Paper text:
The patellamides are eight-residue cyclic peptides containing oxazolines, thiazoles and d-amino acids and are derived from a ribosomally produced precursor peptide. The patellamide gene cluster has been identified (seven genes; patA–patG) and the majority of the proteins or their contributing domains have been assigned specific functions. PatF has been shown to be essential for patellamide production in vivo; however, to date its function has not been confirmed. Cyanobactin family members related to PatF have been shown to possess prenyltransferase activity.
Here, we report the crystal structure of PatF, the first from this cyanobactin enzyme family, to a resolution of 2.1 Å and provide evidence to suggest that it is likely to be an inactive prenyltransferase. The crystal structure of PatF has been solved and comprises a β-­barrel core surrounded by α-helices, which is a known motif for prenyltransferases. PatF is a globular protein with approximate dimensions of 45 × 43 × 53 Å. There is a single disulfide bridge at the C-­terminus linking Cys276 and Cys307. The final refined model contains residues 3–196 and 205–307 of chain A and residues 2–196 and 205–307 of chain B. The missing residues are found on the connecting loop between β8 and α8 and also at the N- and C-termini, all of which are presumed to be disordered. Electrostatic surface-potential representations of PatF highlight a highly electronegative central pore that could disfavour binding of the electronegative DMAPP. Two key interactions of DMATS were identified to involve Lys187 and Asp178, which both play a role in binding DMAPP. In PatF, the structurally equivalent residues to Lys187 and Asp178 are Met136 and His125, respectively. These significant changes mean that Met136 would not form the same salt-bridge interaction as the lysine in DMATS, while His125 would have a repulsive effect on Arg66 (the equivalent of Arg100 in DMATS) rather than a stabilizing interaction. Our data, together with the lack of prenylation of any natural patellamide, indicate that PatF is an inactive prenyltransferase.
Numbering used by the authors: 3 to 196, 205 to 307
Write the structure that this text describes.
Amino acid sequence: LIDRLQNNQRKDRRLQFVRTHQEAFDVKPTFPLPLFEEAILEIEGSCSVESSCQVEGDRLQGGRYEVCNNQGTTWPESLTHAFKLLDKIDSQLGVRINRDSFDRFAAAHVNSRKIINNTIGVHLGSKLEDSSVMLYIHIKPEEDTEELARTALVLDGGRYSDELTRVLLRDTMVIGFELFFDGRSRVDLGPCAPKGKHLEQYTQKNLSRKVNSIFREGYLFGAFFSKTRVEPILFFYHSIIKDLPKYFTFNSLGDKIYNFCQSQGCITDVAIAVTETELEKSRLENFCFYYDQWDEC
């Protein structure tokens, strides 16, 4: 009985995270946000909700969430949530989804024992056609996962140097599939470091001093590469929110997100996603700010 009651309370907290974020950042409940809220209520067990704001100068896009079960391995049953969501979204008039890459990856690795889960997520854009479904595959850190990374690399179809190919083949811990509602899709390969030594080395040899001076200060460092990206997007994960001002200076919108985060409970970690190029600037104008809340808080 107590497990059942706790289970209903997690579901309520999940929704409250998502709603509190909409309130704080003036997000309109535009398609597909209502549908997404219904979808995450169907996830069993305890979930983490990772909300974010994409900032672009004085523009802020706040209707961005990734949700997943945070209690061990739910692959491949976690796929059912993704497919249900995609089915609901595709049936919307004026929405077109190219799910080929995700379907092929899912088909290929359904029986893999090296995958923790997939997430489900949505990113609202300024208009319907710029909005997307976002799906991340989280790979087990302590497995040799070259075969997963190869499949993703093939679906991405980018051409990388020998050095970067090895980083991607060996240290990829997350794979992103972004499905835009105008029919564009993207595959992100996500090498991470606390796996990691190839990314660390690549970073030390190739990336700016500013990147090198901060990337080991959080508990995790990641970079997303894609054929679609001229340069990777770098992610800096921190478990102590108050440490962010030590390493980043924000434009006004970033300060607002930062302040909001420091007043909110239940936050287990934050991340700043930014390009090397944008990190060179005196102030961050173009970046994404992520924060993660656990529904048992």
